Amino acid sequence: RVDWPEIPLPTAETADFLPYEATSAEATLSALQAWLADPAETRLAVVTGDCTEPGAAAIWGLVRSAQSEHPGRIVLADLDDPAVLPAVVASGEPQVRVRNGVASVPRLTRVTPRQDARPLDPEGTVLITGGTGTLGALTARHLVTAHGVRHLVLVSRRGEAPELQEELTALGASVAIAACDVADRAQLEAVLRAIPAEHPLTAVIHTAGVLDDGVVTELTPDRLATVRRPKVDAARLLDELTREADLAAFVLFSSAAGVLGNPGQAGYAAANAELDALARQRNSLDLPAVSIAWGYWATVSGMTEHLGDADLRRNQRIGMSGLPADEGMALLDAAIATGGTLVAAKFDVAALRATAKAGGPVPPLLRGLAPL
């Protein structure tokens, strides 16, 4: 979980920085590319709003990956007061949140699951976005077998998986796979009407999306919206049209990039963090919701297919390991039970601990797990 323990700001009067208050996910990318074009090296102090907002998190995720691309050069400050910005830059942390005079930074802490989520209805219906994707396909096998789901609506752009259709129906699950894009206003509403009344919708699981990983200097706002729409606009439409639905759980598949920040994934991290912050709004409003910043999946899926061996070591550098289907899906059950925004991934504590002790640069979020 993203934890924000209290740490003191440095006793500094000024810093050599370029202040800027972030406004939108596309605006930060445009401003950042302008600053990245400057040969002069002044750390870009990006001021962002309350990260619990979807927009601020998306900007946070966008800068998080950007700071992974250019460490020690972009300051992702969440300040209600630009006066602490010189102090924030002088702290050395790329991401500092200062409220009422005290500072805080994102930290990763282990989550204690709670078994108080409302039980899934054995006669209910579960909605999955991008069902034809393997991650959506993986969820279908576990839901019917473990959770005993007898009614599914697997929604994907192509929306036809006969090989999953026969497999899921062979176990007794009334799986209604229809061609639909969740973010589409007309498509989602009609399919949401296709959910039977005697089998009311009980769970929304978001796994649809596109991957357009690229560095900040090469990303474009269209790639932001192209990735965001089946993830951000899709989940927003899910909460909009299913807030009145009988949802026992609200599952959103985020990525570790959206929380930690992974190089060359500014847009994807923006979508994932905005995906999380939407759930936090849902969770705060007492509706059950879970957004999971999933790690590097071991199994090859329709989403994470393009992660090669170079990305394998890039992932394994920060402690990532191939997330198994069982381990990943077992984490989902606790994540649904726990609720809120959580990160379910496998980390190499010893490698991070050894790297921290040896002197390597440990990410601040990982610094909670392996401090000095």
Between 185-194 and 234-242, two packed helices, what is the crossing angle to 10 degrees? 40
Under 8 Å between Cβ of 291 and 276: yes
- Using DSSP bridges, classify how beta strands 43-47 and 102-104 pair: parallel, antiparallel or unpaired: unpaired
Tokens found for residue 99:
């409220």
What residues contact residue 234 under an 8 Å CB cut-off, 6+ apart?
Answer: 129, 181, 182, 183, 188, 206, 208, 209
Residue 66: alpha-carbon gap to chain centroid? 16
DSSP state string for 44-93:
EEEE---TTSHHHHHHHHHHHHHHHHSTTTEEEEEES-GGGHHHHHHT--
Under 8 Å between Cβ of 131 and 177: yes
Under 8 Å between Cβ of 52 and 246: no
Decide: helix, strand or coil at residue 104. strand
Decide: helix, strand or coil at residue 32. helix
- Using DSSP bridges, classify how beta strands 107-108 and 17-21 pair: parallel, antiparallel or unpaired: unpaired
Residues 194-217 as b/e (b if ≥16 CB within 10 A, e otherwise) read ebeeebebbbbbbbbbbbbbbebe
Under 8 Å between Cβ of 96 and 78: yes
Question: In terms of Cα–Cα distance, which of 160, 177, 266, 170 is closest to 213?
Answer: 266
What residues contact residue 269 under an 8 Å CB cut-off, 6+ apart?
Answer: 61, 62, 64, 65, 255, 257, 258, 259, 261, 262
Residue 297: alpha-carbon gap to chain centroid? 14
Count Cα neighbours of 149 within 13 Å in the Cβ-side half-sphere: 26
Q: What does the radius of gyration of the chain's CA atoms come to, in whole angstroms?
A: 21
Question: How many other CB atoms are found less than 10 A from the CB of residue 190?
Answer: 12
From the number of C-beta atoms within 10 Å of its C-beta (0-12, 13-18, 19+), residue 66 rates as buried
Under 8 Å between Cβ of 168 and 144: yes
Q: How far apart are CA 140 and CA 330, in angstroms?
A: 13
Q: How far apart are CA 164 and CA 168, in angstroms?
A: 6
Question: How many other CB atoms are found less than 10 A from the CB of residue 370?
Answer: 21
Decide: helix, strand or coil at residue 200. coil
Q: How far apart are CA 338 and CA 238, in angstroms?
A: 20
In the block, which residue shows the tokens 């910005």?
Answer: 85
DSSP state string for 227-245:
HHIIIIIHHHHHHHHHSSS
Geometric angle at alpha carbon 146, from 143 and 149, rounded to 5°? 40
What residues contact residue 141 under an 8 Å CB cut-off, 6+ apart?
Answer: 167
Q: How far apart are CA 28 and CA 321, in angstroms?
A: 31
